[PDB]
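Exercise (ungraded).
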Amino acid sequence: MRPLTDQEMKIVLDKLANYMTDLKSLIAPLEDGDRYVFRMQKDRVYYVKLSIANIATCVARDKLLSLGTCLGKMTKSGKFRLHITALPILAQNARYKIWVKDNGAQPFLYGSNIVKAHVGRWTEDCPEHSGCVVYNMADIPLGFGVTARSTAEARRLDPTGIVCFRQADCGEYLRDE
Amino acid sequence: SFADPEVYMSYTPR
Amino acid sequence: IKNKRAEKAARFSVPIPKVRGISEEEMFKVVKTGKKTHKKGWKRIVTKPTFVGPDFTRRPVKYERFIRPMGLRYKKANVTHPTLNVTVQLPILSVKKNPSNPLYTQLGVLTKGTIIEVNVSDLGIVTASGKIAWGRYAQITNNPENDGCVNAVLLV
Amino acid sequence: PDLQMLRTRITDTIRVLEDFQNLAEEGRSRAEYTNQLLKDICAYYGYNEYLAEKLLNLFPPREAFAFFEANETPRPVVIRTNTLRTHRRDLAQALINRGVTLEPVGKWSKVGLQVFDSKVPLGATPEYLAGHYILQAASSFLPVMALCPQENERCLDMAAAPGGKTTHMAALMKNTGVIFANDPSKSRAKGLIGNIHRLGVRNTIVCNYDAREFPRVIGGFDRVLLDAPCSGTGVICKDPSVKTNRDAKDFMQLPHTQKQLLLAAIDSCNHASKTGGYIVYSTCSVCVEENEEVVNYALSRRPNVKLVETGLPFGKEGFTSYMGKTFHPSLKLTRRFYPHLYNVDGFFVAKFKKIG
Amino acid sequence: AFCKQLMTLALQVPEKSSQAILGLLQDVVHTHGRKVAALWNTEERKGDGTYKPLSETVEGSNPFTTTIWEGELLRKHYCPKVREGLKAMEKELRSI
RNA sequence: GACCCUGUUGAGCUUGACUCUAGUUUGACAUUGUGAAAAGACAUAGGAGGUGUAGAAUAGGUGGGAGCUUCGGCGCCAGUG
RNA sequence: UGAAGACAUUGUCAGGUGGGGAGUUCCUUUAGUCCCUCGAAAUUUGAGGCUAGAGGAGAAAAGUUACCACAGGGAUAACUGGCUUGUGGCGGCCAAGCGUAGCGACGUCGCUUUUUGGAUGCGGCUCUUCCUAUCAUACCGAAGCAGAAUUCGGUAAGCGUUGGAUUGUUCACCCACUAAUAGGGAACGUGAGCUGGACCGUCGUGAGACAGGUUA
């Protein structure tokens, strides 16, 4: 385990700001004089409490397997990719969010792209290729992705037309079983 | 008959 | 073996929530409804018989587009014990090595001469330590693609 | 031979043992009758002589018959609702609206539900995928209820491979504090991390260690849970290998490891704890060689620890005495669960407080 | 968060200001309802985190991890007006 | 359609020395006093106790012991362990 | 000189981690003496210890994959054409032979498999001619074939050979006539007639979009 470097922090925060509004909220100190920090184990970034990181320092590097919340993985070429494990933090601080019905929520959970035939609520004034967290009609965090068109284009779009591109869904928990 | 009548988990509803 | 199976299945069977997931064909149709532009040949069907195990599993993106149909899936094999000369129908536990393709042994493709893991509990084979064997190696020795059955010889 | 005839002989022999003084034979003895019962039950239920004899020795004839029936019968499907995401009523309402038969397991748990049958896969529900519930057993419900954790505590789960107990703990510590979830298996640690992330636990540290190494590694935990590896005599339905694959050497190896694990847990917990000095020993076996022998060992080779009330609804008091071995009198507090009495896997729980 | 802090304020402000705040929350519960009913039903209290009163941010303070308890003091407040204000507010809460 | 290869990418697997040490972290001890109120373990002298199953029966445990005497009930032997 | 207070702070040892700073070039398995220590249970075990094989220039990055996506290159470019039909596969036993262990038919045993009775995801109609793998009509052989009604088989293409329900269509089943209401070929274009896309450009790429251009 080690802290992130400056370039790594810049890349991780670029992705996180692509999907969120407030990030000083993520790095802000808490009541007990504790704060959330970033750690790296193998090729995966972990969003953790500073106290938890300091107390987990005693665990050997080759025998530490997880810590806090897994935020993503740094690729071989130096590119950060988020995960359905990182979905919750996107849920607290989502910029753009798109709701789907059950008949589109099940396809998304199978790993398909969102369609306006599945959409049941929009986010007003959404640019073409932005950051949208996909919910169901019960405000249940279901996934995240990038939308394909703007709000007006999606409204005037064919009911059978791709509106959002899938990157992660909650069905990967059935992958890692 | 070795079944606690209060909290034995039944296989059938109720 | 059959009488023991009949006793257990006739008088130790109790109501249990028994359901199954949807097939990869249904999953593919749904994701295709979700994805308009169909890349040509994006679907390759595995046309050889396979073993899977679980029902509603999510495959890695590495293999997500390999579709193994229900009509081709097999769950039990006619396994022959040579020394205790007898053939019995036994469930398949896993696929260990298809000597033709690592992709086939990853997918569970059952071809001729293929090592699989078989449940040998019904045989009552006593080990050296005195235990009953719950899994052994068996080689598929037929052509399951030409014969609608899987035939294995147990390596013991 | 004829299995119906074997069962008829079993029932007749149980009746003879019930009324031996009145209903008997010319010269055949009770020992001969029990030998006939043992042979019949080994030939019918597919047990070996060793484990069958332990189970027959532990239970009275009729109760042993019921125990073996329960072992041959699959236990019910139970789901623990995640307090970190929802609550029982809303989860049950959503699942019923989705097409499943749900109802609370009883009055002993506020955070669990039973499934009588379903129309959709319970592991494929959007609620499950969002982490609203986990497929779990009541036997694993019990240890966390014994080791009810508070907020802002440091806790050590010494064998957390599935993850259900660890997630129950983090729900009761309201995602506060630190949990050290340990596994000696990496392949099962994958599923452990998966469950943790699915159910949304942020206070966990997943480590790959032999659990005997923790006083060296960190030590000083506020509360410790030890679901010790065991014979599996209470989970025979899920693992039918136990019936014929447990003999004397195995029943000598396993308890020694259990002794060392409990001693490690005791040494890893701290005495001067402002909120709790509790160690919970737990197992899914019913055999005495794996039950309360380890507790007597612990109480005899660290007197700085004492048994406390489990604070737990149901179960039977443990055995203060057995076939010659006389135990410390406090072992009546440790409680025991059987599939035939309670439709929960055979299980054993014990609570320790450190005092030094 | 504003409902919780406004209940605390209604506890600790003069009578007519308290009645004003209480009527404002009455209208808020009438308008929104289900969004804040969990603040009064304790079995829908969220279990992920602890309520943080002295928070720097509205989201930093977890408002759904606490319950509106201020009624047991504002009901024995000395002002009959704020008393029927609580009565009407609880009536709307029950008639949701 | 399909087969082989190359480049970039993704997913996965493996490697990435040793010795001290910053930092971080667990435990024990020390400054260090005066009292008071409780708790645990050490010191005796006493008092009361032992109900898994089967066994008539609430069998701490070990030892000798075939015969025991408020001289009539017990033993032993049979069980059951 | 005032405030807090036997708590902090601080210090010494034993340790854990150390992808950071400075310097230099331990565990696991195997076989053995039943040789030693620790732990457990009592009438036996587990972990270490020994002998010598096997695993793990160095925080810059490196190796690897019958896998995925994009881009590109090479080979191949149709294909069946004395083809096809009614009798499964696997293992054992037997087995004339060939051979001097190996190949091995017909059978028989074991699995599939047993002690109480919807599938389908180009179709349809008319006409000519031909085939027989014959549904009917003609003649025969057999069957507890009494009679009547039939069943199986043989020679026969001379002569005839539907409709309904349902379904996206077809089939199965099921229902009405009828003597019966068979199946096919017209040869890579199923005899004649009728009827019911790919190249570039730009912008992105965890992914597509363009009333952008061109083209058979």
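Further reading is listed at the end of the chapter. For now, observe: The longest strand of chain A covers residues 162-169. Residues 53-58, 73, 75-77, 79, 81 of chain A lie near RNA strand F (CB under 10 Å from a C1').
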